[PDB]
Amino acid sequence: SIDTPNYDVQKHINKLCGMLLITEDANHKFTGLIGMLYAMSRLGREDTIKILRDAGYHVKANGVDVTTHRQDINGFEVLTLASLTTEIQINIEIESRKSYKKMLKEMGEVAPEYRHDSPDCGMIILCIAALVITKLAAGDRSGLTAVIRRANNVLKNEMKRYKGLLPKDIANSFYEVFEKHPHFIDVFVHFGIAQSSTRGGSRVEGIFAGLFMNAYGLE
């Protein structure tokens, strides 16, 4: 049973990535999965199922819909995911709202590029996935330090924008997800090939394409 989000929930997943990125000392236990859910929503449900079936995996596709969940504590829009509980999703939102308020007080109005809903949030998470994927050939988690060294350089502007962009934690989460769910390696690679075809004004889409290509990695 694997969740296959369609284009309709891409904006939601993008915001979920952004919520983790704005969280001070964020718990990145689910970031690998969330990043992979974003990649799948970018491919769309049909192409995801096609990749999975063509790679030889048997897939029981779970539809992903947005539901309103009532849980009034000290007073939520969630996705129907077999892989991620309503509780986990709501706690990600709660913790980010706390980090948002700290940010709004400190500097007044939060600039677009420092928000949880910046269009490029999902791609910032996928940039770490691109680095881990490069090192995955090794067969172990040996390449994690090189992932941190490389991230700290290529994502310098993004780390400056997001307190929750913790390469060590995010890289560990992706290593975990690719080890635990190898079908995500196939999904990520097809996402990367499809993505690196697009050409736009987004700085992070450009950084991702360069990271995925890894022309300097082979050389």
Q: What is the DSSP letter of 75?
A: -
Partner residues linked to 66 by β-bridges:
79
Asked whether the beta carbons of 95 and 26 are under 8 A apart, the reply is yes
Partner residues linked to 77 by β-bridges:
68
Q: How many CA atoms lie within 13 A of 181 on its CB side?
A: 19
How was this model experimentally determined? X-ray
Only one residue has tokens 């849980």, namely 71
Which segments within the chain are labelled E, that is strand? 2-3, 61-62, 66-68, 77-79
- The tokens for 148 are 């941190």
Cα 21 to Cα 82, 118, 160, 177, distances in angstroms: 23, 10, 11, 19
Angle (nearest 5°) at CA 161 between 88 and 108: 90
- The tokens for 170 are 């995010």
CA 213 – CA 15 distance, rounded (Å): 26
Q: Resolution to 1 decimal, in Å?
A: 2.8
Angle (nearest 5°) at CA 26 between 2 and 1: 5
Helix axes 167-180, 31-43, angle to 10 degrees: 70
Q: How far apart are the first and last CA of the chain?
A: 39
Per residue, the 3-state secondary structure of 79-127, as one string, reads ECCCCCCHHHHHHHHHHHHHHHHHHHHHHCCCCHHHCCCCCCHHHHHHH
Asked whether the beta carbons of 15 and 117 are under 8 A apart, the reply is yes
Three-state DSSP class for 25? coil
Cβ count near 149 (within 10 Å): 12
2-3 vs 61-62, strand pairing mode? parallel
